[PDB]
């Protein structure tokens, strides 16, 4: 069925980097034309900013520009999120999203709460 596997909480040191393991699944009925668009969000409920966007990065918020990267393989269903140069401001929740088709998109509500420490 549809879903995403990632840790619920993750902690990193300011200045360092953080890697969030992530894997997603979708029904074998599966369509294959959308090229699967992966998108990570930050503060989905509040300001909801884009951390990455396989579609077009021009949609990525200036806050995460060049400070985040998708370490995955759609062909393996890997969505790992790499955070470069951590800062305290990076603390918060991250949620993944992927789209195979217009009416076949999914968002992980669990997300991953990232808290940057010293």
């Amino acid at each position: 069925t549809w879903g995403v596997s990632s840790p619920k909480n993750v902690q990193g040191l300011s200045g360092s980097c953080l890697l969030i393991p992530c894997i997603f699944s979708y029904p074998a009925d599966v369509p294959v034309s959308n090229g699967i668009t992966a998108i990570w969000y930050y503060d989905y409920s509040g300001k909801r900013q884009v951390v990455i966007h396989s579609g077009d990065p021009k949609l990525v918020d200036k806050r995460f520009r060049g400070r985040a990267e998708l370490m995955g393989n759609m062909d393996h269903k890997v969505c790992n999120l790499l955070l470069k140069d951590l800062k305290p401001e990076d603390s918060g929740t991250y949620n993944f999203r992927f789209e195979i088709s217009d009416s076949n998109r999914w968002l992980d509500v669990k997300g991953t709460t990232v808290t940057v420490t010293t």
């Binding site: 989905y44 409920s45 909801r48 998109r105 968002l107």
Partner: peptide, 6 residues
């Protein structure tokens, strides 16, 4: 888009 809104 839909579902969650916003």
């Amino acid at each position: 888009g839909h579902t969650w809104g916003h």
